Amino acid sequence: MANELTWHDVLAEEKQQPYFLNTLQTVASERQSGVTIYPPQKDVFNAFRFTELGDVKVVILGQDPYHGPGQAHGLAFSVRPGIAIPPSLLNMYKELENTIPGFTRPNHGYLESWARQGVLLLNTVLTVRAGQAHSHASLGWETFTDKVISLINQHREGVVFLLWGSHAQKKGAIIDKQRHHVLKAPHPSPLSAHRGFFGCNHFVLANQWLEQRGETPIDWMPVLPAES
């Protein structure tokens, strides 16, 4: 709804922060020089565009955004339509198919429908440089995304964070285990996957928790067409 608070009130105070600004003043210079920066600026804050504070239910963190063309668009793991399904996702798709019944691979890495459910797909660092993996880290984003978390953790009760990978598990250390449901597991990545992820069943336990508090469960089957 707007159902409690908006990102702008808990973020009125940060976005006008010295560090955050350099962070964007920086990217500003580069793009200027001619360094293709992904993803486009209009898309930078898309997660926050689609999942208001007061509407978070679940939370999945990503570290660095897709440095490859056509892929990135603001939401973690989410690739645009047409954009070939990145290994990571694939493994999620499967694990999904496997645990949730009836799920059958979407065939589009487009995951907007999830955020429209109240799932925040937050990449810890928000921008990066094409081809240059992890190229925009320590530029301050982590710091923005770090505060962002204490926000939900402190001004929101009973949240679901799914922690995949050690990095992100480093992130939610602050999260109160008592106030917010925190499921952990390896990284959907081809490497991580087999050895913890596959089988984690994070997608279902997630909803068991939401149903529990009487909430609306999540339809992990991403829809694509909306308008046309």
Curated annotation (Swiss-Prot):
Gene3D superfamilies: Uracil-DNA glycosylase-like domain. One of its GO terms (molecular function) is uracil DNA N-glycosylase activity. GO terms for biological process: base-excision repair, AP site formation via deaminated base removal. Keywords: Cytoplasm, DNA damage, DNA repair, Hydrolase. The keyword Cytoplasm applies. It is an enzyme of class 3 (hydrolase). SUPFAM superfamilies: Uracil-DNA glycosylase-like. The active site is at residue 64. Signal peptide: none annotated. The keyword Cell division does not apply. It is found in: Cytoplasm. It catalyses: Hydrolyzes single-stranded DNA or mismatched double-stranded DNA and polynucleotides, releasing free uracil. Monomer. Excises uracil residues from the DNA which can arise as a result of misincorporation of dUMP residues by DNA polymerase or due to deamination of cytosine. HAMAP family: UDG (MF_00148). Belongs to the uracil-DNA glycosylase (UDG) superfamily. UNG family. This is Uracil-DNA glycosylase. It comes from Escherichia coli (strain K12).
